[PDB]
Amino acid sequence: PLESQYQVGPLLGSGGFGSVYSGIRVSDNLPVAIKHVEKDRISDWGELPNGTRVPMEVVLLKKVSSGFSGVIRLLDWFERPDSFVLILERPEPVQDLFDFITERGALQEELARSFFWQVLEAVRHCHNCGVLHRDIKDENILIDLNRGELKLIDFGSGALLKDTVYTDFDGTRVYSPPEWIRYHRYHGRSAAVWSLGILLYDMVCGDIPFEHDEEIIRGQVFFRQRVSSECQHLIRWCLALRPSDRPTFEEIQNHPWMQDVLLPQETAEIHLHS
Numbered sequence: 001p002l003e004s005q006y007q008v009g010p011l012l013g014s015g016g017f018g019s020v021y022s023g024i025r026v027s028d029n030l031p032v033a034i035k036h037v038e039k040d041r042i043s044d045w046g047e048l049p050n051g052t053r054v055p056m057e058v059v060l061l062k063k064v065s066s067g068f069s070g071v072i073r074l075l076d077w078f079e080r081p082d083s084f085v086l087i088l089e090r091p092e093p094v095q096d097l098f099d100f101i102t103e104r105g106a107l108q109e110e111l112a113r114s115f116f117w118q119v120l121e122a123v124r125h126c127h128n129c130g131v132l133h134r135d136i137k138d139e140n141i142l143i144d145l146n147r148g149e150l151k152l153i154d155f156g157s158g159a160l161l162k163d164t165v166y167t168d169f170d171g172t173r174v175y176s177p178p179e180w181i182r183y184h185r186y187h188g189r190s191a192a193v194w195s196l197g198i199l200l201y202d203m204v205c206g207d208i209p210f211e212h213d214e215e216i217i218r219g220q221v222f223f224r225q226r227v228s229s230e231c232q233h234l235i236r237w238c239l240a241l242r243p244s245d246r247p248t249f250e251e252i253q254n255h256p257w258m259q260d261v262l263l264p265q266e267t268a269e270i271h272l273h274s
């Protein structure tokens, strides 16, 4: 087989998620993203059904890879002496939500509703597959600008979903809940809802609501942009200080602010000018 099945293109990005390059599967010109991850920098390892040591990221991706398009799919992976190479889907054209928000500022509520709904559907799919992302944020969401479809990326801080407490976390701090800040303890679902509240605020205000630990613990949300009362209400519910006071995914999707969502294709035609 060998890495020769792909043609490497420009470097797309680099950070705590490794180095990701644009690529093309040679056998059928399929667009792909090629992620290199150094073995030394992988902290959380897992096991494949057959007893092979792979990055947790590979285990989680396999569990969420199938028909549904709300998550970027793992097409293949390789092991090198000092690294792992993951071959992932690559929509074209695409822009991550962080760059999209940097360029356009705060999003109209109609656009934030379509986007947020799609993130909720993707997170539900991950949880239904027994996977917790633990790093939901704008930088980890890609927008397929032609189809108006959002795709979750970088499962490198994720874990298998469980009903017991998590005492470890290596995702983004400014998106982490007060219970992790103060006690180093959180439950998967409620911590995810907290990050979804941070993300929703980020979408409708153009920036995250909290920067310091003190602000997260206090949980007081100030709106810097004009935002409807219903949206503000949903945000404040997602950012409730007590985990049990937060909405479940069902309660979020049945909220009045979430009604009459646009389909992804309508979303692109009206807001992505495509």
Ligand SMILES: O=c1c(O)c(-c2ccc(O)c(O)c2)oc2cc(O)cc(O)c12
Binding pocket: 012, 013, 017, 020, 032, 033, 035, 072, 088, 089, 090, 091, 092, 094, 142, 153, 154, 155
């Ligand atoms: O298709 C793409 C993709 O999958 C990824 C990706 C996947 C997993 C990661 O962990 C990550 O950091 C990036 O980035 C991209 C960046 C681009 O500019 C354009 C793309 O088409 C992709």
